[PDB]
Design a protein around this ligand. Structure first.
Ligand code: SF4
Lengths: 695, 83
DNA sequence: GCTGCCCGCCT
RNA sequence: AGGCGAGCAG
């Protein structure tokens, strides 16, 4: 037997390779995987007829010696019209690896005298492997019977790998990255000058601390230039062979720049940034994001300022390194502005030393923030709930965990899957403003009204047609998740140790995220169904209108509203009184809808609302400033403009006179030209070529 | 097109900006939609907005260079656009 | 990432 | 007639 905790996967040469660790890293190449093709017989036809007709044709086309085909009975209740609910299908296991034309698919519309519909024609090898083997996220695999690992094995058939019940998960090889960048005004390419590498192999103290550096103008390792630096990086990265790579904004800036500088120098060992070995770059190097995501498959992208990471620190506003450290760790770090174009870095040793010190500080801070906010554990729970890629879970997808959960749950129940508002009160409110989140609005609607694919009779020909309300599959899954969350709350009531309390906090937040990402399945998506989405939207409209009436009855004025959150004005200037009123409103709403559990999300001592999603406020946590949607968030406005805006907001008759005084002396500064120029910078993207604009 | 032709003509003959607002607002026998949509355009016409360009009136050449009038249009040179 | 349409705003 | 912001369907 072979025991291996898998972490990632990739697709090459019609083969599926799982990247995992055996604790040292290991490989398993999975050959013999078969797309599960399901053919729906005509009215009065049997899977034996489909077998007799298509199977010899499939042998002729694909040149096999034998094809496994059996009749199996399965359901269908999705949006494809005139497909009967229950019938007898013919399961043909067509392997991904075929002697001839392995890149040609069978269209879903193959109409024959035996069958008229085809399913699984474009199934994904990783998706099919995970669905058939029912693998719900990264866990143990029981394996029985080309890479940068020390252990490399393979299995001839997919059934040789069976998931294990064990809940433990061994030590990971972590690696934080923070890279100083240089811009060369000749080619406008971001050249790497120094890298700090820190490995947490198993305020935690790193096992090792390494810093490479190249001269920008003319342990710590010194190099003559960039190329030897980066080759040594690749070699020591293979030696380290980390399970997870950590950093700040690695997803769309830093790893992109690293890969581009990897190509520009033409290094051969650039495949050590992932775990899969390669000799040459993909031929065609939006698509670049996908290509580095593919090559790095095997090493785990842990971005802490990415979408998933930033979703865990809403108290951040720019999500910068010092700010995130300050908010998550309550520790002060002053960011040092290091620009290597300055001539002092070519001859002054002390400046280069301070730059390296700041780089090492940045790397330690990134790692500490990563471990503090517990991104890894939360994403692990999300993936084990969804059964998708945990690489995808960190990557920051929307249709990633809204599809594989439905795939797993419906395939475990023998279901054929289809192939792949109130106007705002604009102005300043003196009283406290409470943020209340209705993220559990639609899922409660689904579970309460039993809306699903198998319960709501909807005219499939006319998707614009609204059906009528009818236990469903989706409501049962949602109710099970909610009951798991209830058990989590009950154990929180009793638990003593902070550690397990925090773990259960992660667990409850994971269930809340999974349950509240369930509308992305049919609203936005491989499971889109307009009648259901529009129905639930209507019912949520009804619930929101009732909530408005209740708020008006409790002497409250709603300032702004949507299906995602409801803003309320308490009418008191006390934090305690506002909290009490918000709790009362939550209780009354939960009384009017027993499955709609709402809560207090954020508190605003002072709120200046400008539009639907454009506002600024004094968040109480201590009061902290917040802004969403004002001009001080766009690129086209200089840091001086943002500073003027932040001070104006902080000030807001004495406040207005102070605003006038500040405007006068900043004008006197500007006309005299007594303000540093970099405060006047304006940035703006072009999605097109510079020559290619009418205006 | 008719609005622009007529506005720049009436500027060229010498109508004041305030009397221009007065007349244009009068001819539309709401004020809300006016202040919402037409006031800014009329003030832009007199160069009293934007880059501060007091746009010189269209001539018969430029007016003819405008796309041909249709139903609901009255701009152009009627020695052309009429029968 | 690309197109059509609806509204809001500026030149 | 054009650009900035969203929402929709492909
Ligand atoms: S030719 Fe036509 S457009 Fe030109 S001045 Fe005479 S009437 Fe006006």
């Amino acid at each position: 037997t072979f025991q291996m905790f898998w972490l990632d996967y990739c697709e090459v040469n019609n083969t599926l390779i799982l990247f995992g660790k055996v604790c040292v890293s290991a490989m398993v190449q999975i050959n013999g995987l078969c797309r599960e093709l399901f053919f729906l017989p005509r009215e009065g036809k049997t899977p034996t007829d489909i077998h007799e007709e298509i199977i010899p044709l499939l042998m002729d086309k694909y040149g096999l010696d034998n094809i496994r085909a059996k009749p199996q009975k399965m359901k269908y209740s999705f949006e494809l019209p005139d497909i009967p609910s229950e019938s007898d299908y013919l399961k043909v296991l067509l392997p991904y690896q075929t002697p001839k034309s392995s890149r040609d698919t069978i269209p879903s519309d193959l109409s024959s005298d035996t069958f008229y519909h085809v399913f699984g024609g474009n199934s994904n090898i990783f998706e099919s492997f995970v669905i058939q083997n029912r693998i719900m996220g990264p866990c143990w695999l029981d394996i029985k019977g080309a890479s940068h690992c020390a252990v490399e094995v393979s299995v001839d058939k997919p059934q040789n790998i069976t998931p294990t019940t064990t809940k433990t998960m061994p030590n990971l090889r972590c690696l934080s990255l923070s890279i100083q960048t240089l811009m060369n005004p000749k080619e406008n390419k971001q050249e790497i000058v120094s890298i700090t590498l820190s490995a947490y192999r198993n305020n935690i103290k790193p096992d090792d601390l390494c810093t490479l550096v190249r001269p920008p103008q003319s342990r710590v390792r010194l190099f003559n230039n960039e190329k030897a630096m980066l080759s040594c990086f690749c070699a020591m990265l293979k030696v380290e062979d980390p399970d997870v790579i950590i950093g700040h904004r690695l997803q769309n800036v830093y790893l992109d720049v690293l890969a581009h500088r990897m190509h520009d120098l033409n290094i051969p060992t650039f495949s050590s940034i992932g775990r899969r070995l390669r000799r040459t770059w993909p031929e065609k190097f939006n698509m670049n994001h996908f290509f580095i995501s593919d090559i790095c498959s095997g090493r785990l992208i842990c971005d802490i300022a990415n979408e998933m990471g930033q979703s865990l620190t809403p108290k951040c506003q720019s999500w910068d390194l010092s700010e995130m450290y300050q908010v998550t760790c309550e520790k002060e770090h002053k960011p040092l502005d290091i620009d290597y174009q300055n001539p002092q870095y070519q001859n002054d040793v002390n400046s280069m030393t301070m730059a390296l010190q700041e780089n090492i500080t940045n790397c330690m801070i990134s790692a500490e923030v990563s471990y503090r906010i517990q991104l890894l554990t939360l994403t692990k729970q999300l993936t084990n709930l969804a059964g998708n890629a945990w690489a995808q879970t960190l990557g920051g997808t929307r249709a990633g965990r809204n599809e594989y959960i439905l795939l797993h749950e419906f395939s475990r129940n023998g279901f054929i899957v289809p192939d792949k508002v109130f106007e705002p009160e604009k102005g300043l409110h003196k009283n406290y403003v409470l943020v209340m989140d209705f993220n559990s609005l639609y899922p409660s609607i689904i579970q309460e009204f039993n809306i699903c694919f198998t319960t709501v009779d909807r005219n499939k020909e006319d998707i614009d047609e609204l059906p009528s309300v009818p236990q469903g599959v989706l409501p049962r899954l949602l109710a099970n998740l909610v009951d798991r969350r209830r058990e989590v709350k009950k154990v929180m009531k009793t638990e003593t140790d902070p550690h397990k309390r925090v773990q259960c906090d992660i667990r409850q937040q994971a269930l809340k995220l999974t349950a509240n990402s369930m509308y992305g399945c049919l609203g936005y998506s491989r499971f889109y169904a307009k009648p259901l989405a529009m129905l639930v939207t209507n019912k949520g409209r009804e619930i929101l209108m009732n909530t408005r009436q209740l708020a008006e009855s409790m002497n409250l004025l709603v300032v702004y509203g949507d299906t995602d959150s409801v803003m309320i004005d308490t009418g008191c200037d006390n934090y305690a009184d506002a909290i009490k009123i918000g709790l009362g409103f939550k209780r009354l709403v939960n009384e009017r809808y027993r499955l709609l559990e709402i809560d207090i999300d954020n508190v605003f001592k002072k709120l200046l609302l400008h539009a639907k999603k454009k506002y600024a406020a004094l968040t109480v946590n201590t009061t902290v400033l917040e802004v969403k949607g004002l001009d001080m968030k766009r690129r086209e406005f200089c840091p001086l403009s943002r500073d003027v805006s932040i001070h104006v907001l902080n000030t807001i008759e004495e406040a207005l006179q102070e605003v006038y005084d500040y405007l006068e002396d900043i004008r006197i500064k500007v006309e005299t030209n007594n303000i540093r120029i970099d405060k006047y910078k304006i940035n703006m993207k072009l999605s097109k070529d510079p020559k290619a604009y009418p205006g | 097109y008719g609005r622009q032709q007529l506005s720049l003509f009436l500027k060229g003959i010498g109508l004041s900006a305030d009397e221009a607002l007065k007349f244009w607002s009068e001819a539309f026998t709401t004020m809300e939609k006016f202040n919402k949509e037409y006031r800014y355009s009329f003030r832009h016409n007199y160069g009293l907005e934007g880059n501060r360009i007091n746009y010189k009136p269209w001539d018969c050449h430029t007016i003819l260079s405008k796309p041909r009038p249709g139903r609901g249009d009255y701009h152009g040179c009627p020695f052309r656009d009429w029968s």
